[PDB]
């Protein structure tokens, strides 16, 4: 009837990326786009809004039959997974994300680290002249994991195509590993890697089919 399927996984970052946080709103260091972190601690957490706008964009260009021009209006096989602002049949989305926190701090200090964020020197050349506008950025750490949870649920009636939805989520997460995630990842910054992709039942109302 009504089950709560949880897709627990570990987002392993094979390359340090960059996410533009709240500009002109930090504390002691607000230079070269301060990366958003935790409002209580200092461990930089990844926002869940980037995982919804990037996964839907990469999926709406391979599983569709019409070129999309505005959000909440692309095909129909993926509109019920994220939402629709025009259809009156369904409004709520069946996919619930979560701000994955960095759980790798239990053994990161044992390897001998300095800080969680560093300043990378990266500028540009105006071709016609020498060095111009020596800008810089701020990246995070490399080879880190994130405890991500995917809350999935059905609406009773959405039962005769449960197996059809499993092949869409698995194909969407695998395709995201071969693409940059976050912001300004064109220089080889993103490229995530979902590690230990398993499923479990918390509420206990539906059997366990997939596992790997």
């Amino acid at each position: 009837t009504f089950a709560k399927i949880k897709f627990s996984a570990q987002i392993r970052l094979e390359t340090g990326l960059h996410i533009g946080g709240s500009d002109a709103f930090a504390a002691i260091g607000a230079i070269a786009s301060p990366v958003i972190k935790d409002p209580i601690t200092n461990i930089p957490i990844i926002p869940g809004s980037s995982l919804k706008g990037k996964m839907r964009t990469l999926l709406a260009k391979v599983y569709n039959e019409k070129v999309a021009e505005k959000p909440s209006d692309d095909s129909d096989i993926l509109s019920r997974l994220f939402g629709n602002s025009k259809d009156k049949r369904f409004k709520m989305g069946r996919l619930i994300f979560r701000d994955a926190f960095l759980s790798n701090a239990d053994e990161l200090d044992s390897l001998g680290v300095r800080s969680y964020t560093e300043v990378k020197f990266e500028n540009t050349i105006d071709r016609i002249t020498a060095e111009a506008n020596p800008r810089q950025i701020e990246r995070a750490i490399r080879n880190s994991t994130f405890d991500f949870e995917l809350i999935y649920e059905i609406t009773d009636e959405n039962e005769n195509q449960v197996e059809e939805d499993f092949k869409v989520i698995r194909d969407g997460l695998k395709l995201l590993e071969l693409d940059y995630l976050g912001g300004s990842g064109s220089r080889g910054y993103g490229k995530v890697a979902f590690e230990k992709l398993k499923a479990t039942t918390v509420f206990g109302n539906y059997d366990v089919k997939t596992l790997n």
Binding site: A27, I28, G29, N42, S115, T117, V119
Partner: protein, 108 residues
């Protein structure tokens, strides 16, 4: 704290300061990464960063004449010994901004 820093930093010597914001990108990174980390865990746990901060004001101070003249006037090495508590360390981190904000007010 911030009232006596606007007059001591201005009183220097010859104008046109050659020390820009490029040669200070080494000692200003550990201080900014200390106020935001000391508030999470305790002060007795972070022992590899407190002793390492004093080394930067000793080894790097002898590599250029434009470094020792600013440490002796601002009295940086004196405040490194008085601090010992987590609440006291938070006060020294706020004083570092006076040597950077007021430095670019008259030039850059």
């Amino acid at each position: 704290k911030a009232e006596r820093a606007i007059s001591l930093l201005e009183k220097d010597n010859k104008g046109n300061y050659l020390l820009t914001t490029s040669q200070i990108r080494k000692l200003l990174s550990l201080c900014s990464s200390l106020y935001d980390r000391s508030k999470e865990r305790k002060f007795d746990e972070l022992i590899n960063d407190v002793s390492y901060l004093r080394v930067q004001f000793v080894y790097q101070a002898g590599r250029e004449i434009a470094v020792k003249d600013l440490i002796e006037k601002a009295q940086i090495l004196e405040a490194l010994k008085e601090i010992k508590d987590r609440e006291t360390l938070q006060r020294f981190c706020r004083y570092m901004e006076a040597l950077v904000a007021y430095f670019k007010f008259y030039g850059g």
